[PDB]
Amino acid sequence: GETLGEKWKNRLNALGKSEFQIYKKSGIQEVDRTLAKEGIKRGETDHHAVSRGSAKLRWFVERNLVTPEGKVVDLGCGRGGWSYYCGGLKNVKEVKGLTKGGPGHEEPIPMSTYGWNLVRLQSGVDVFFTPPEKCDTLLCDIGESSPNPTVEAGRTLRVLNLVENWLNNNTQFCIKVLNPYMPSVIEKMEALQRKYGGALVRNPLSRNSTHEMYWVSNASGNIVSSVNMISRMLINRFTMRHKKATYEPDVDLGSGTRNIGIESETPNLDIIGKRIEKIKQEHETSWHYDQDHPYKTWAYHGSYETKQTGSASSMVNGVVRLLTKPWDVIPMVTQMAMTDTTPFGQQRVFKEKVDTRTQEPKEGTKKLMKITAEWLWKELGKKKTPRMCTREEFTRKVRSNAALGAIFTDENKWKSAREAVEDSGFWELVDKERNLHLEGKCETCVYNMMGKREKKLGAKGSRAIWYMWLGARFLEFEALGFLNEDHWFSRENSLSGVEGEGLHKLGYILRDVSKKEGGAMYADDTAGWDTRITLEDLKNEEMVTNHMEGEHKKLAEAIFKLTYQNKVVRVQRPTPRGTVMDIISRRDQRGSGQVVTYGLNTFTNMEAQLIRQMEGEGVFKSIQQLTATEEIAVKNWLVRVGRERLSRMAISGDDCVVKPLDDRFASALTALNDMGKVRKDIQQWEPSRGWNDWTQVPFCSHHFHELIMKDGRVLVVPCRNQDELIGRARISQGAGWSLRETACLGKSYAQMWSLMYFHRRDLRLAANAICSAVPSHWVPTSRTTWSIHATHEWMTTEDMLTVWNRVWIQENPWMEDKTPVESWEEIPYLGKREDQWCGSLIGLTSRATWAKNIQTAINQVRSLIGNEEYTDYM
């Protein structure tokens, strides 16, 4: 107890629980955190500080003791109070916050306070093991208190030695010095101040229970004198009549994005100009240029007022939760949330995934891609001829409620596509655009980005669905509809394709691929495929026009050149004035209708995988340039083995399965990375990991087992981890729903489980329990899956054993013996250990109790729905 600070510490440790709680607040400045805490709990992301820290930092910033500017690095950001505060500061350009996550430590909170798009917070970082990087401002609020000041000195010195590695001559800084009164800390502080300047300043918002002082860059003052003055002040507050803490107002951190000047995109305004001006004239009443727009790699054209769309909410399907009670304690089931489709939820995803640039492929890569696409269009075009689809074909499609992409119908003029298509006024609008397309002009073909409502383990932000105007969708169908209409990507035509295949018969295809001689089976996922589509890809896909003539070639060239290679997009954004619709543009990336996307993603993925196959086989040595001899080699390889190399793949969209000639493919990565098709959750140059068991190969969110029947017949069945299936079934799409609509949704899940996951003990039990607890005549409602391969044969009131027989026996091409199954008892399960491996609770007492007492839970749901006609399926 030699220093004044140590004398304070002894006195502080001698206090009792109540005297300490009283002393802690005596005469200090305090922010009333109640409105922010409440607002944040309601899900409010604007205005509120995530902690007391924003006010603490503001106290220093307002006095010019620290001037945050340029790149700000915040060490131990916690919830992000200092980071979010800095985000709204004029001279700040970028905020990087690093914090240790996990138990006992605060996790970063997502906020939409002013300049949030310039702030990136990172959890799971021990800053003591982080490589220092360039910054203009270094903030640090690390220092855990302890009754032992020697322990505190050690902790403080560890922080001081850390901050030193991140400091240079021009660095602005605000560093917490937890224990500034210990002699070892004074000594290190003196050394640090001699080199970097600054001084130790006490914040009046600090509690008396701490002697923390901050090392701020713009202050001046003697360390010993400053520290002893705070010890004296802190010792005096012991015996001073409890003065209440002076209440300060909490900080208003505003709202909205910020523009820092990065604009990396040159639009072709001769191509996109008419489209922008039409939007601009239609919204003249609210049109403005927002100088704080967040777009970096997308050209910004202006904004207009719009009414907010999408939801952040998520409801539990009670019918399913009541009938799957052992899963209430499994986090991988319960932490399943719905995606945030609101303008903030969307903007967060845009920032992270969509506002990115893909590097231009090298000269050899470009040659490889052009040669392969030329060859591949000629292959697909052998037994098929490109044609124009018709208005009557399109009309038939909308009438029959068939598969069209995401479409907008002009809510004023027409409420539905059916209402529109049946009106001659709609086709007059189509003709005006058609005639403009015939003269290389585009005026209406603009995409409406809307958040995709998905179930994920979050809550996570939303992916974008690119809606087209029904007229823009017709012009696309007329020109490129033949790819889907005539099945160019069917397995018979494209040998890699799986177009028109139900999700249940995809395992039979993976089995036929495994029958080939070769290496392991590779199933690498691309990190955001649609954003990784270059202008090279778009120009190589356009080459299908070389197989077209006259009016059809001019119309398809308009879709490619004007609408795909020069996209105009409308996206929502939250602002201090309310929600706005932004007009933005991008030349590269995938932006087409959902159906044409599928085909062009299959084509380009078929082409990228053949190139990855040529690389592994050494058909070309370098991507920098392709020699005249390597061109002849690539063309001969394609002409000689191209078709059998296509037969080694199952290519859905961006989703692929490849059984190469050998495992040289695992490390054949230079062309893949250069094409921009970078693999997900793996270091760029780390070799791929394949599978030596086809039943373990992931494809279209499933793996597939071989299932031996009682009669010896073999089924190949779709399977997934059981928690993904239950977790998804237990979440209802949206908010505000009647029990009728919920029970019909759970019934769609139950019947999906009966047709596809019958081999899963817990799922066949839970599915029969839902169908018993839901009135038998009730029609199943809403989508169970987004899957383009989902057949939805479970969306019926027809006997599920009759449907099972039709799918698995009658219509199954890999089922030679057409003998129907007389009962569900005849249908098998996976082996008990196979089932347990894929997430089954079979063999647990809790699951046994659940199964034994399932009639109690069936009756509980029956009571909540009310006495109706029920059939027992148990």
Ligand SMILES: C[S@@+](CC[C@H](N)C(=O)[O-])C[C@H]1O[C@@H](n2cnc3c(N)ncnc32)[C@H](O)[C@@H]1O
């Ligand atoms: C006092 S809080 C910061 C308050 C923050 N400035 C705010 O306004 O929200 C310090 C944070 O540092 C974190 N932390 C502690 N040791 C760390 C380490 N080695 N690396 C990174 N963060 C760490 C703690 O989890 C804690 O949330």
Ligand SMILES: [Zn+2]
């Ligand atoms: Zn157009």
Ligand SMILES: [Zn+2]
């Ligand atoms: Zn399985």
